[PDB]
Amino acid sequence: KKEYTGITYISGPLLFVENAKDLAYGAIVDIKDGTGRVRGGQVIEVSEEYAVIQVFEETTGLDLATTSVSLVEDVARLGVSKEMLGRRFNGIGKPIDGLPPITPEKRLPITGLPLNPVARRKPEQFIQTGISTIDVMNTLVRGQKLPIFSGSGLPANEIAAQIARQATVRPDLSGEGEKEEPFAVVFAAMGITQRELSYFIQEFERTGALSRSVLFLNKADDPTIERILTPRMALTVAEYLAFEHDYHVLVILTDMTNYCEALREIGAAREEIPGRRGYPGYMYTDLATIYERAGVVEGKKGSVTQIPILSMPDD
Amino acid sequence: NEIAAQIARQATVRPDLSGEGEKEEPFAVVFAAMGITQRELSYFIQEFERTGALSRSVLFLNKADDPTIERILTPRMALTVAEYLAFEHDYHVLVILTDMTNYCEALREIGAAREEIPGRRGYPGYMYTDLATIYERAGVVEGKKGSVTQIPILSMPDD
Amino acid sequence: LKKEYTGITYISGPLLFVENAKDLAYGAIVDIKDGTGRVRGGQVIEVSEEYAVIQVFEETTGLDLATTSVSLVEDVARLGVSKEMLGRRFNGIGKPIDGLPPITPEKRLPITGLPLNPVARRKPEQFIQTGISTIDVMNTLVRGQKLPIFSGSGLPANEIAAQIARQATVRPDLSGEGEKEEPFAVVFAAMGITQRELSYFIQEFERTGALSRSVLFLNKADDPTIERILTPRMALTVAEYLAFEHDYHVLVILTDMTNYCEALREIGAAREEIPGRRGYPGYMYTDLATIYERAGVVEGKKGSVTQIPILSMPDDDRTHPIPDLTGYITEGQIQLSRELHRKGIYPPIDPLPSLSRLMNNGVGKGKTREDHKQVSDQLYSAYANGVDIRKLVAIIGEDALTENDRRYLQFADAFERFFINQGQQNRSIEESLQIAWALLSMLPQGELKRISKDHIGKYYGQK
Amino acid sequence: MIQGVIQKIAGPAVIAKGMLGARMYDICKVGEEGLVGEIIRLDGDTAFVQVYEDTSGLKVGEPVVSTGLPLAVELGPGMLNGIYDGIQRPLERIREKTGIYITRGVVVHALDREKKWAWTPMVKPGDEVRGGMVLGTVPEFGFTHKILVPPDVRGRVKEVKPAGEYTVEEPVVVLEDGTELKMYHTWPVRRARPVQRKLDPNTPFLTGMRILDVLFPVAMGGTAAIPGPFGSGKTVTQQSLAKWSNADVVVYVGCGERGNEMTDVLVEFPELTDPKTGGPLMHRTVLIANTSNMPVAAREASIYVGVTIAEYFRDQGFSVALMADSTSRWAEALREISSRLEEMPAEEGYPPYLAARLAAFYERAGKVITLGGEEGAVTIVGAVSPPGGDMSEPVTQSTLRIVGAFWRLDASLAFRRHFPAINWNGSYSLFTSALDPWYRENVAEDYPELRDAISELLQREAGLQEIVQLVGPDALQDAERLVIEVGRIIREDFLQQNAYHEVDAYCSMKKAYGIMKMILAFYKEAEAAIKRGVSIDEILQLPVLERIGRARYVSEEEFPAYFEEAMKEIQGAFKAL
Amino acid sequence: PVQRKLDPNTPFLTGMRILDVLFPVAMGGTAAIPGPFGSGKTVTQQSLAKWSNADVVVYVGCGERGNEMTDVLVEFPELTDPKTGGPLMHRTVLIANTSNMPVAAREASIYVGVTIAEYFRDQGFSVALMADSTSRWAEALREISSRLEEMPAEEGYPPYLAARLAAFYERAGKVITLGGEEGAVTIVGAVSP
Amino acid sequence: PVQRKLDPNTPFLTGMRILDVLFPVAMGGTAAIPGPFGSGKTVTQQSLAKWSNADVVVYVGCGERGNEMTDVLVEFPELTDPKTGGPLMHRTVLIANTSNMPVAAREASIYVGVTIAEYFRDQGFSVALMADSTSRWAEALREISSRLEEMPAEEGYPPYLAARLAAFYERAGKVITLGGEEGAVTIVGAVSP
Amino acid sequence: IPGIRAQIRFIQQVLEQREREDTFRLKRIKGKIEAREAEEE
Ligand SMILES: Nc1ncnc2c1ncn2[C@@H]1O[C@H](COP(=O)(O)OP(=O)(O)O)[C@@H](O)[C@H]1O
Ligand SMILES: Nc1ncnc2c1ncn2[C@@H]1O[C@H](COP(=O)(O)OP(=O)(O)O)[C@@H](O)[C@H]1O
Ligand SMILES: [Mg+2]
C-alpha cells in the first residue's frame, strides 16, 4: 500500500524518491521493478522533498518510469521459535533444507537493544571445549567473548567444527547443576565457499551435533547485505533462547574477515572519509554492536558465549 | 623550556673581545606564548621572577584554555612590540616564541574551515608565507643600535 | 567556408569556453584567432548543447572576450601521409621543420589507431640485428616485438637510441634465401626532449647517411604538451601505414615514455577529473596499451613493425607504474645500469636483469645460426656465477679459490670489457658470435655444460 | 526501445536526453553508427551512457536508441569452434568483413544466422515444458548438442516443427501463449543460470598429469589457481589439461593479455589433437580472446561471458573445464572501471567490491543436477599472475581465499628441466579429504595411505636437504642418503613427465598407483635391508631401478602385466643380497 | 573558576611499584597511558581506581567494554578504602558510556566527568578522574565531524582535535578554591592507539 | 628572439673542484641543484656567483631569506672580479623577492631575471643566472590556484607547473644572437624539496 | 629480513593512506566546483 512513485534520480546503489515526507528515517522499503522483481532497500537521509533510498542489491533493470517503492515493516524484525534447533537457515532466515518454515513464537528486532550496565552480572561459570589448551591454559568462561585469531592457511574451519560438535557444559563438576542444562550452539558461518559449506553440512549431520545447533550458513556468492545481517540474525536467535528459555548458547561467528570486507563494500555508499586500511571510521562501533551482545544477565540463568573466528590477513 | 630560560637568563654579549667598550645594555625579553599549559608557565614565571627579568620583559600569554584562534594574532603582537622597542628605542631585544607547533595547528584549523588546498599532512598551502612573515621580522638594521634575536621553540611531532 | 564561433566566455589557464557550438565534434582541432592575428591550436573536449570547451595548446596571453574567435579545422585529427616522407622532420602535429616543402599527401589517416584483429596476426618469427652485441646474442630483438629499454636518469639512453637507429638492419642472408630487396625504415618519435638532445639527433642522423631511410618526429619540451600526447600516435600511424601497405619492415623508436606519461598526467588533470594510483590517471594502462599494441607481424602481409620504447625509470624502481605497466604489456626489457656506466662501458647494458620473452622463437637454425640459444644460455650462466665469485673474492683473497672459480673470475672481467664495451662499432651477428666463443674459450670444455656436443666440437678453441 | 538524443559528450561519457524509461544497465546504440555503451545513472529525464569505443567524432545531436536488454550473451547451437571476444563477437567474421582491423561500428551476430542445422524433435505436440527441459537435438560435431527451454518460460505446446533442417532464427516450438521458442536465446551475463541442487565434491577432475591428480587433486566442480612466471611451462600445462583432460567441453578465456602471448594460442590451440577422435581439438572448444587495447568493458566482462557460456554447456549434462587466464589482468580492467566511476579505492587502487566480484566468478563452478535432471560441472582452473612474484597482492590474496586448490609453478624447476614444473612445497589441495572414498572404492583400497607416505617422504627430503647443502650427498648417514635417493627417484619418475611423449602424457589412476606402490615397496624393503646385509652402493647399482625408471613409458593397455613383473622382480632382487 | 592555581609538589600515590617509584605523578598532574590491546591498560586503570590516595574518584569510561563497568559495580561495594573504612564504592562516581551505547554521547561523557570532578575539587578534595579511551572520544569527534561535512586532517580527525583535547586536560591542577580552602584534581587518560 | 642555437663546447668553470671536474657543465647548459634544508645550497650558489668565469651574473633570490642577500650587498664590493679589474658588484644584477615580501611576485621574479639575462646575452656577453628555490615559485602557483579553485594535480601543484618549468629552463643555451655575435645564458636552478 | 619487510609494509601502508585522503579531497573540490558552477542561480 501507498507505493511512492516519482523517483527522481538513480545513480549507484542510491535512488531518490521524491515527495516522500511520510517515510521515517531508517525505515525499510522494497523497490518493485517493472518486471516485478522486488528488492530490499533502506531509507537514509529523508529530506523535506526526497528520501535517499539505498538499494542493497544491484540496481539492474530499475528505471524511472515504472518503478514503485513500498514501505515494509519500519524496523527489521525476525520470527523466532524454539523449534529452530536442528535446522539450517540462510543468512537472513530462509530455511535451506526443505523442512517447512518456522511459525514465529515471537517477532523481535534484529539489532537488539544495548544491555544495561547495571543489569549485567559477571561471567562466572565454566564451559568445556574439547581442546586441552582452550580448557586448561586459556579457559572459556561462559558469558565472555573471545576470538580465535587464525591466519592465512591455518585450519580455522576444522577447529570451528570441532569445538562446535563436541563442546559441552558439564554441571556435575560443580554441584546442584540440574544435570541436563539446556545447551545449544548457534553457528553463524559467513562468507564461506561451497566446499566449506558441504564440509559443515556433513560434519554436523554425522553425530547429533545438529540436533542442538542452529545454523546460519552464508555461501559467499549472495548479496553482501546478507553477509552483513548474518551475525545479527544469529545473535537475535541466541539472545531469545538464552534469555527466555535459560540456555547456555555458544555462538561461533565463522569468518569475521568477510563480515568486515562486506562492511567496507556496502558502507561506501554514503561517501565518507575512511579509516586506516580503507575500512570505515565507524567499524569499532559496528564490531561492538555485535560483540557486546554476549554476556550474562543478573536475574536470569541463561548465558551467551561467543567465539569470533577471524584470520589475520597477513600474519 | 629550561634551555630557553637558561639562554635568556645568561646570554650576554662580550665587549672584552671586540673593543666596543662596556656600556652594557642587557636584554629586553618579549616572551610570547601559545598554548602553554600551566605547568610550563609557572616554570617561566618562577624563573623570571627569580633571576630579575620581569622588569625588562613583556609577556604575551595565551594559555591552552583560551580560545584557539588568537594564536594567529599572538606572534604578530610580540613582534610588533619587538620591532618598536628595538628599532625606535635602541634595545637589544630577545624574543622567545614558545611552541610554534601550536601556532601551526591554530592555522591548520582556520585553513581547513575554508577548504584551502593543503600542503602535506593537512597544513595549508600558504603556511610557509605565514612562518616567513613571523620569522623574518628579525635581525639588525644598518644605522641603528637595535636588534631582535629570535629563539622560537618547536615540538617536533614524532621527533 | 569557415564559421567563426566568436562569442566566447571564460578563459581560464588552458581552457576557454565557446557559447554556441553544436557543430564541433568531440575531439576536433581548432584555430583560435587572437585580437591581433596570431593563430593558436586547440582541441575540443566536452562539447555540450549550451557551450563547448576548447583546450588551447599554447600559452593564452593575447586573448580577451571581444576579439577572439575559434574556427574548425579537420574535425577528427588526421595526418596527411605519403611514402615520400623518408627524409623529413616533423613537430608533433606533423608540419615540416626542416625547410623542405610540405608533402603531397596521397592519403589522410586518423591518428588514433584501429586495433588489430588477433585472428589476423601471425606470430613473430625472425630476427633483426641491431649491431649491439649484448642485444643480438643474449636477448634478440625479433620482428613484430615490442621491448623497451629501461634507462636510468644519467645514463646515455639517447645515444644508444641513435645507435640502434642508424645501425639496425634486417639481414636477408641468413634466413632461408629471401629476396634481399626487403626495404627498411626507422620511425623515430622523440617526445619531450631538450634543445640539446635535438641538435644531437639532427647532427647524429645527418652525418652518417641514415636520414634517407628514417623519419623523425621531434618535439622539444617547451612545445605544447598535447602535441606531445599526439606524437606517438603520429609515429605509429606512419609506421603502420608504411609496413602494412608498402611491405616495409619498420622499426619504431619511442624516446622518453616517461615524458609521455607525465604529459598524460597533466592533461588528465586539465580534463577536470580524478587520478588513480600514485597520482597517475586511471586509464593509463589502456592508454599505453593503445600505443604498444600497434606493433606486430600480420598473417599475409609481408611487412612488420618492431618497437623499442626507451624510457627512464623515475627513481630507479621497476615498481613505479611507468615501468610496471610498460613491462606488463611489452615483452622483456633490456636494462641499462649505472655501475657499468661508471666503470665506463658503452653501451652499459647489463645482461643479468635483461630479458626478451620472444628470443627463443626467433633465433636458432635457419633464422640466424644453429648454436645461438645455447651460446646465449651459457654466456648468461657463466657471467652470472662469475659475478658472485667477484663479490666473494673481496673477502676470501684470490689464493683460496680453486682453479675453476679463478677462471670464472677472468671470464667475467674480460666479458664485460670485450663483449659489452663495444664502443661505437658495428658488430654484425657473426662477429658477435665469434667474440662469444672466444670469450667462452677461457673456460675448459665440459665446464660448458649447457652447449651440446657438436658446437663445443666445432667452435671452441679460439683466441 | 526508447530513443533519445545526445546533449553532452565528454570523453566516453555521453549524457543523453529524451530517454525516460531506459532500464538501468541496459546497453544502447549511440550515434548513427551504433557504438555500444551502457546506461548508468538515470537522472530525471537524462541517462549517462558510457561508450565502449572511443567517441572521437560524435556531435551533439546524434540519436541514441536503447536495446532494452542488459549485457546479453547469445546461447545457442553453433558456438563451438569459435574465437569470440569479451562481449561475444566472432573475430573470424570481423576479419572476413573489415580486413585486419576491428573498426568501430561493426555489427556482427554471434551465431550464424545463415547455417542450417538438422533438427530432431523430442517433444510431442501437446506436452508441457518448463525451464531447462530438453526439446530436441542438433548434430554439431559428433556431439549431440541439445536445445533447452530458456530458464523462465513454461507452458504447454502445440506446433513443434518436424525433423527439418532449419536455421537458428526459426521458431521450432510455439507455446500456447504465442511464445515462439527459437533454437537460441539470450541471457544476462551477470546472473547464475538457475539449477536445482549444487552437489558436493565426490569425484576427481582427472587431469592426466600425475602430480595434479595424485598429490594435489582438484575434484570436479572445484577450483584451482596457478601463477605463471616466465619460462615455467605455463602454456604446455594449460594445453595439456585441455587436451588430455576429463571434461568434454573446454572453454578458454584469455581475458586481456599481450598480443603475441595470445597469437601463439590462436596459431597453436586450433592445431592440437583431441585424443578421442584424432580430429582437431576445437570441436569441443570455445575460445574467448582479448588483447589489451580492446576496450575496457570488454576486458572486464570477458570472464563473465566465459563462465556463462560454460554454464550453458553445463546445463546440457556435459562436464566442462574452464581455463580463465591471467585474472590479474581482469582485475586491473576492473580497477580502470572503478577509476572512471569516481570511486574511492581499496588497499591498492582496486575497488572495495573486488572480493565480491572474484567470488561471483569462482563460485559459479560446481557439480550440479540441472533443471533437466542430469549432472554436470564447470570446473575452473583459473590462473593468476602477480606482477612481482608478490603474493599478498590483493587479487592473489582474494583468489587464494576462495579457491580450492593452488598449484605453484616455479621457474627454477623449469630451469632445472623438471616438467610439469609444479612445486610440491608451496602448492596445496583442500579436496583430499572429500575424495577419500572415491579413491578407496575405485582406484585401490589403500590409496591415500601410500599417498601420505610419499607426501611425507618428499617432506623429509626437503627437510634434510640442509646438511646436504652444507656437506654433500656422499657423506651422510646411511639411512638419510637413502631418503634423498628415493626422493630423487620419486622426482625423476613419478613427478617429471614429458608432455610430448605419446604415452607418458596421459596417466590414469591405476598406472599412477602402480608406479607409486612400486617405488614405495622398493623403499620399504631397502630401508629394512640397509641395517642388516647391504651397503648403499650395493643398492643404487641394481637393475630394477631402470625398470622403475622405464615404468612410466608403458601403455595402460599393457601396464598391469608389466607391474606384476616389476613387483616380483623387486621381491627377488632384494632377496638376492 | 578558581581563585589561583598552585603548582604541584605532592605525589599522587598510585599504589603500584613502577608508577610511583620510577615515573611518579604529582597531585595536580596529568598523565597518559597509551597502550595497544592485550597489554592490560584496564587492569591498571582499575588498580588506580582501588588503590590510590584520592579522596573521590570519578571513573569515566567512554566507548569501552561493558564487562569493565559491571566488574566495577559488582566487586567494588565489598572492598575497603585504606583511608576511611567503609565500602570503596562510597567514594567513586562512575560515568559509563559503553561502546554500543550511542556514539554522540561519548563526546559529552568526558565533559560530564570532568565537571563532576571539578565540583568535588571545589569542595576541597583530591579527586582522581580517569578517562578511559580518549581515542574513542576522538573517534566520536570524527563521526560528528564527517556528518557535518568538514575537511579533515591526518586520518579523518577534525583539525580542532588538539584544541578540544588540550582544553580537556587543562582543567586539572592543584588550586585554592574560591572559598579559600585548597584542593586538587588529577587526571589519568587512557589512550588506545 | 634569436638567430641560432649552437651546441655547447665550452665549460662553465665554477671554481669548485667536484663541479668542474666530475660533473661539468657547459656554457649554454641548464643545471639543477636540489637539497634539504641546511645542506649547503645557498653557500654553493654564492661561491658559483663569486668565482665563475661568466661576464655578468644575475642572482634571483626567489623566496629566500634576507640576511643571505644582505651578505651579497655588503661583502661583494670588497671583492674583485677575477677576469678583469672591476669590483665584483659591478657584474651582478641582483633580483631579490624575499620570503615575507608578497607572494604573487615570485613568478615575476623568475621571469624578470631570465629576461634580463637574455638581454645581456643578446648584447654578446655570457651570463650566468643563479636562481634559487624554484619550488618557492611552485608554492606561489599553488596558493593562487587555491584561490582560483582550479583542480590541483598531485601534491597540490597546478597542472601547468612542468609546462612553465620547461618554458623557463629552455631559455638558456649558447646562441648566435640576432646581432651576429655569440653569447650564452647558463641557468643554475636550486631546488628545495 | 622480516623486520625490514615489516617496516616496508608499514611505510607502504601510510603512503597509500595519504593517497586515499588526497583522492577524497579531490572529490570534495570537484563537488564544490560543480555544485556552484552548474546550478548557482
Ligand atoms: N564560504 C566559504 N567559506 C570559507 N572559505 C571559502 C568559502 N568559499 C570559498 N572559500 C575559499 O576561499 C577561496 C575563494 O576563492 P574565489 O572565491 O575563487 O575567489 P576570491 O579569491 O576572490 O574569493 C577558495 O579557494 C576557497 O578555498
Ligand atoms: N663550500 C663550503 N665551504 C664552507 N662551508 C660551507 C660550504 N658549503 C656549505 N657550507 C656550510 O653549510 C651551511 C649551509 O648553508 P646554506 O647553503 O644556506 O644551506 P642551504 O642548503 O639551506 O641553503 C652553511 O652554514 C655553511 O657554513
Ligand atoms: Mg636556502
mmCIF file of C-alpha atoms in Angstrom, chain A residues 26-209:
data_model
loop_
_atom_site.group_PDB
_atom_site.id
_atom_site.type_symbol
_atom_site.label_atom_id
_atom_site.label_comp_id
_atom_site.label_asym_id
_atom_site.label_seq_id
_atom_site.Cartn_x
_atom_site.Cartn_y
_atom_site.Cartn_z
ATOM 1 C CA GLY A 26 15.899 4.254 8.779
ATOM 2 C CA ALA A 27 12.757 2.581 7.518
ATOM 3 C CA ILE A 28 12.958 -0.356 5.166
ATOM 4 C CA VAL A 29 11.406 -0.274 1.750
ATOM 5 C CA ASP A 30 11.183 -2.737 -1.065
ATOM 6 C CA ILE A 31 11.666 -1.464 -4.588
ATOM 7 C CA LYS A 32 9.436 -3.006 -7.236
ATOM 8 C CA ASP A 33 10.743 -3.265 -10.779
ATOM 9 C CA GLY A 34 8.535 -3.115 -13.866
ATOM 10 C CA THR A 35 9.106 -6.836 -14.412
ATOM 11 C CA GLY A 36 8.076 -7.474 -10.806
ATOM 12 C CA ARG A 37 11.463 -8.148 -9.215
ATOM 13 C CA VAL A 38 11.321 -6.750 -5.692
ATOM 14 C CA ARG A 39 14.432 -5.742 -3.754
ATOM 15 C CA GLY A 40 15.261 -4.619 -0.287
ATOM 16 C CA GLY A 41 16.415 -1.122 0.457
ATOM 17 C CA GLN A 42 16.815 1.244 3.360
ATOM 18 C CA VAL A 43 15.744 4.863 3.678
ATOM 19 C CA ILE A 44 18.663 7.076 4.552
ATOM 20 C CA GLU A 45 18.601 10.879 4.733
ATOM 21 C CA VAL A 46 14.931 11.744 4.483
ATOM 22 C CA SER A 47 14.679 15.390 3.466
ATOM 23 C CA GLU A 48 11.638 17.587 3.179
ATOM 24 C CA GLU A 49 11.459 16.764 -0.507
ATOM 25 C CA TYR A 50 13.075 13.406 -1.233
ATOM 26 C CA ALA A 51 14.453 10.386 0.536
ATOM 27 C CA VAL A 52 17.690 8.668 -0.419
ATOM 28 C CA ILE A 53 16.780 5.011 -0.696
ATOM 29 C CA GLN A 54 19.820 2.769 -0.702
ATOM 30 C CA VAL A 55 19.381 -0.347 -2.799
ATOM 31 C CA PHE A 56 21.255 -3.128 -1.043
ATOM 32 C CA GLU A 57 21.464 -5.404 -4.064
ATOM 33 C CA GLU A 58 22.269 -4.274 -7.611
ATOM 34 C CA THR A 59 20.295 -1.546 -9.374
ATOM 35 C CA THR A 60 19.820 -3.506 -12.573
ATOM 36 C CA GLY A 61 16.617 -3.292 -14.501
ATOM 37 C CA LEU A 62 15.481 -0.325 -12.453
ATOM 38 C CA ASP A 63 14.131 2.672 -14.321
ATOM 39 C CA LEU A 64 12.322 5.899 -13.654
ATOM 40 C CA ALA A 65 9.016 5.407 -15.446
ATOM 41 C CA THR A 66 7.623 2.256 -13.863
ATOM 42 C CA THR A 67 9.392 1.753 -10.524
ATOM 43 C CA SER A 68 7.489 1.644 -7.267
ATOM 44 C CA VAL A 69 8.631 1.935 -3.671
ATOM 45 C CA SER A 70 6.589 0.341 -0.932
ATOM 46 C CA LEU A 71 7.212 0.557 2.827
ATOM 47 C CA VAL A 72 7.705 -2.731 4.651
ATOM 48 C CA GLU A 73 7.978 -3.012 8.410
ATOM 49 C CA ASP A 74 9.872 0.050 9.756
ATOM 50 C CA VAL A 75 12.237 -1.976 11.957
ATOM 51 C CA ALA A 76 13.873 -5.170 10.683
ATOM 52 C CA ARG A 77 12.162 -7.846 12.733
ATOM 53 C CA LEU A 78 12.584 -11.592 12.922
ATOM 54 C CA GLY A 79 10.350 -14.512 13.699
ATOM 55 C CA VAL A 80 11.941 -16.822 16.246
ATOM 56 C CA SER A 81 10.741 -20.061 17.802
ATOM 57 C CA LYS A 82 12.356 -22.730 19.904
ATOM 58 C CA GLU A 83 11.815 -25.318 17.158
ATOM 59 C CA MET A 84 14.625 -23.704 15.218
ATOM 60 C CA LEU A 85 17.072 -26.066 16.924
ATOM 61 C CA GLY A 86 18.099 -28.693 14.415
ATOM 62 C CA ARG A 87 17.522 -26.726 11.249
ATOM 63 C CA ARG A 88 19.785 -24.829 8.887
ATOM 64 C CA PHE A 89 18.806 -21.350 7.750
ATOM 65 C CA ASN A 90 20.025 -18.818 5.246
ATOM 66 C CA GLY A 91 21.924 -15.676 6.117
ATOM 67 C CA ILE A 92 18.533 -13.987 6.568
ATOM 68 C CA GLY A 93 16.481 -16.861 7.924
ATOM 69 C CA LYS A 94 15.179 -18.549 4.825
ATOM 70 C CA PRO A 95 15.224 -22.282 5.548
ATOM 71 C CA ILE A 96 17.576 -24.261 3.393
ATOM 72 C CA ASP A 97 16.925 -27.898 3.947
ATOM 73 C CA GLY A 98 13.386 -28.316 2.631
ATOM 74 C CA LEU A 99 11.910 -28.737 6.100
ATOM 75 C CA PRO A 100 8.889 -26.442 6.363
ATOM 76 C CA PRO A 101 9.431 -22.907 7.656
ATOM 77 C CA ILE A 102 9.005 -21.516 11.148
ATOM 78 C CA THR A 103 5.827 -20.204 12.632
ATOM 79 C CA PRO A 104 7.071 -17.300 14.800
ATOM 80 C CA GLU A 105 6.643 -17.690 18.529
ATOM 81 C CA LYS A 106 7.859 -14.075 18.702
ATOM 82 C CA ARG A 107 8.858 -11.382 16.229
ATOM 83 C CA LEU A 108 11.640 -9.252 17.606
ATOM 84 C CA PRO A 109 14.158 -6.716 16.285
ATOM 85 C CA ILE A 110 17.447 -7.915 14.870
ATOM 86 C CA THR A 111 19.574 -5.014 16.032
ATOM 87 C CA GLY A 112 18.936 -5.718 19.687
ATOM 88 C CA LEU A 113 18.949 -3.095 22.345
ATOM 89 C CA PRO A 114 22.028 -2.396 24.481
ATOM 90 C CA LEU A 115 22.099 -4.230 27.766
ATOM 91 C CA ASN A 116 22.022 -2.037 30.781
ATOM 92 C CA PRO A 117 25.402 -1.984 32.587
ATOM 93 C CA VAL A 118 23.682 -2.329 35.944
ATOM 94 C CA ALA A 119 21.733 -5.324 34.688
ATOM 95 C CA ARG A 120 24.685 -7.389 33.565
ATOM 96 C CA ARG A 121 26.308 -9.620 36.177
ATOM 97 C CA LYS A 122 29.762 -11.068 35.954
ATOM 98 C CA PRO A 123 30.736 -14.122 33.878
ATOM 99 C CA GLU A 124 31.214 -16.823 36.444
ATOM 100 C CA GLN A 125 30.996 -20.443 35.447
ATOM 101 C CA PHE A 126 32.966 -22.600 33.055
ATOM 102 C CA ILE A 127 32.194 -24.289 29.776
ATOM 103 C CA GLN A 128 34.264 -27.053 28.371
ATOM 104 C CA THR A 129 35.549 -27.270 24.872
ATOM 105 C CA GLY A 130 37.409 -30.327 23.806
ATOM 106 C CA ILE A 131 40.680 -28.572 23.197
ATOM 107 C CA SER A 132 43.108 -29.003 26.042
ATOM 108 C CA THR A 133 44.858 -25.679 25.557
ATOM 109 C CA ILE A 134 41.482 -23.914 25.401
ATOM 110 C CA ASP A 135 40.298 -25.632 28.519
ATOM 111 C CA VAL A 136 43.361 -25.503 30.770
ATOM 112 C CA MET A 137 45.763 -22.790 29.722
ATOM 113 C CA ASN A 138 43.202 -20.391 28.399
ATOM 114 C CA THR A 139 39.705 -21.076 29.712
ATOM 115 C CA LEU A 140 36.436 -20.216 28.078
ATOM 116 C CA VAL A 141 34.284 -18.852 30.868
ATOM 117 C CA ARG A 142 30.718 -18.783 29.691
ATOM 118 C CA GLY A 143 29.422 -15.315 29.217
ATOM 119 C CA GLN A 144 32.555 -13.951 27.620
ATOM 120 C CA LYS A 145 33.522 -13.356 24.042
ATOM 121 C CA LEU A 146 36.954 -14.451 22.924
ATOM 122 C CA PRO A 147 38.300 -14.665 19.392
ATOM 123 C CA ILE A 148 40.352 -17.249 17.602
ATOM 124 C CA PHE A 149 42.988 -15.402 15.600
ATOM 125 C CA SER A 150 43.830 -17.794 12.807
ATOM 126 C CA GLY A 151 45.946 -16.944 9.793
ATOM 127 C CA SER A 152 46.025 -17.424 6.060
ATOM 128 C CA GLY A 153 46.488 -21.157 5.539
ATOM 129 C CA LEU A 154 45.793 -22.355 9.066
ATOM 130 C CA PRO A 155 42.885 -24.647 9.858
ATOM 131 C CA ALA A 156 40.206 -22.441 11.291
ATOM 132 C CA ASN A 157 37.119 -24.169 9.974
ATOM 133 C CA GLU A 158 38.277 -27.524 11.282
ATOM 134 C CA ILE A 159 38.618 -26.179 14.809
ATOM 135 C CA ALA A 160 35.326 -24.301 14.441
ATOM 136 C CA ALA A 161 33.549 -27.528 13.550
ATOM 137 C CA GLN A 162 35.365 -29.471 16.257
ATOM 138 C CA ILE A 163 34.571 -27.218 19.199
ATOM 139 C CA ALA A 164 31.095 -26.864 17.783
ATOM 140 C CA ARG A 165 30.300 -30.556 17.598
ATOM 141 C CA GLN A 166 31.968 -31.592 20.827
ATOM 142 C CA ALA A 167 31.795 -28.737 23.332
ATOM 143 C CA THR A 168 29.568 -29.448 26.296
ATOM 144 C CA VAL A 169 28.844 -27.853 29.614
ATOM 145 C CA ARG A 170 29.348 -30.226 32.490
ATOM 146 C CA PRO A 171 27.431 -29.209 35.606
ATOM 147 C CA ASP A 172 28.479 -32.331 37.503
ATOM 148 C CA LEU A 173 31.923 -30.860 38.124
ATOM 149 C CA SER A 174 30.199 -28.355 40.320
ATOM 150 C CA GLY A 175 27.101 -29.367 42.274
ATOM 151 C CA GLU A 176 23.349 -28.645 42.058
ATOM 152 C CA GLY A 177 23.516 -28.497 38.293
ATOM 153 C CA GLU A 178 20.107 -29.857 37.229
ATOM 154 C CA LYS A 179 22.365 -32.111 35.255
ATOM 155 C CA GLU A 180 20.764 -31.684 31.845
ATOM 156 C CA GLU A 181 21.354 -27.968 31.495
ATOM 157 C CA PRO A 182 19.888 -26.920 28.152
ATOM 158 C CA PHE A 183 22.737 -26.207 25.780
ATOM 159 C CA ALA A 184 22.843 -25.005 22.202
ATOM 160 C CA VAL A 185 25.308 -23.801 19.602
ATOM 161 C CA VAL A 186 24.451 -21.094 17.119
ATOM 162 C CA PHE A 187 26.885 -21.445 14.253
ATOM 163 C CA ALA A 188 26.930 -18.392 12.005
ATOM 164 C CA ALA A 189 29.090 -19.163 9.005
ATOM 165 C CA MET A 190 29.567 -16.051 6.925
ATOM 166 C CA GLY A 191 31.365 -15.593 3.632
ATOM 167 C CA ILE A 192 32.030 -19.309 3.139
ATOM 168 C CA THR A 193 32.517 -21.200 -0.099
ATOM 169 C CA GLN A 194 30.637 -24.244 -1.316
ATOM 170 C CA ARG A 195 33.295 -26.720 -0.250
ATOM 171 C CA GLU A 196 33.397 -25.367 3.294
ATOM 172 C CA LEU A 197 29.617 -25.359 3.292
ATOM 173 C CA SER A 198 29.348 -29.022 2.343
ATOM 174 C CA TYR A 199 32.026 -29.764 4.914
ATOM 175 C CA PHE A 200 29.953 -28.188 7.662
ATOM 176 C CA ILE A 201 26.802 -29.952 6.435
ATOM 177 C CA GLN A 202 28.350 -33.372 6.755
ATOM 178 C CA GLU A 203 30.213 -32.517 9.935
ATOM 179 C CA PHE A 204 27.033 -31.583 11.721
ATOM 180 C CA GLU A 205 24.925 -34.401 10.342
ATOM 181 C CA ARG A 206 27.442 -37.059 11.317
ATOM 182 C CA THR A 207 26.915 -37.007 15.071
ATOM 183 C CA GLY A 208 23.974 -35.493 16.926
ATOM 184 C CA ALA A 209 25.523 -32.030 16.884
#
